[PDB]
């Protein structure tokens, strides 16, 4: 609780009470998720890091062209 108080105090200038979080979470539906993702994640840039037996590893351009589907 103390960690949450301090973290929210620094991040927002306040502490958000539970009821507010739940009320804002409730009203999100599928179309809203499908809007935000389309806003920030569709056809975006990505960064990659890895370690180990990376002979299999995909290309950067593969991961980047993955962010959109040609179907639809």
């Amino acid at each position: 609780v103390a960690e949450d108080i301090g973290r929210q105090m620094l991040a927002y200038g306040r502490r958000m009470p539970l009821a507010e979080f739940l009320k804002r979470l409730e009203v999100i539906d599928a179309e809203e998720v499908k809007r935000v993702a389309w806003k920030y994640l569709h056809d975006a840039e990505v960064a990659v890091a890895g370690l180990g037996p990376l002979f299999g590893m995909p290309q950067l351009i593969n991961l980047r062209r993955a962010t959109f589907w040609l179907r639809y």
Partner: protein, 61 residues
């Protein structure tokens, strides 16, 4: 390390390194391709000479 091609210049790097690449390529091909070419061109010219002399020797009085 690799950078996404959306965050790179991609026609300036080609011209920026043009003279070096062209020097290398042309230097590599001089002796092997051109010198025999020049000799062959020579031979064609000499053949033409021989023919244009023949055609008068054989058929002109």
């Amino acid at each position: 390390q690799t950078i996404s091609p959306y965050q790179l210049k991609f026609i300036y790097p080609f011209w920026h390194t043009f003279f070096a690449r062209c020097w290398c390529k042309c230097s590599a091909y001089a002796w092997p391709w051109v010198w025999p070419g020049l000799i062959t061109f020579g031979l064609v010219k000499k053949m033409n000479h021989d023919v244009e002399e023949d055609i008068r020797d054989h058929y002109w009085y």
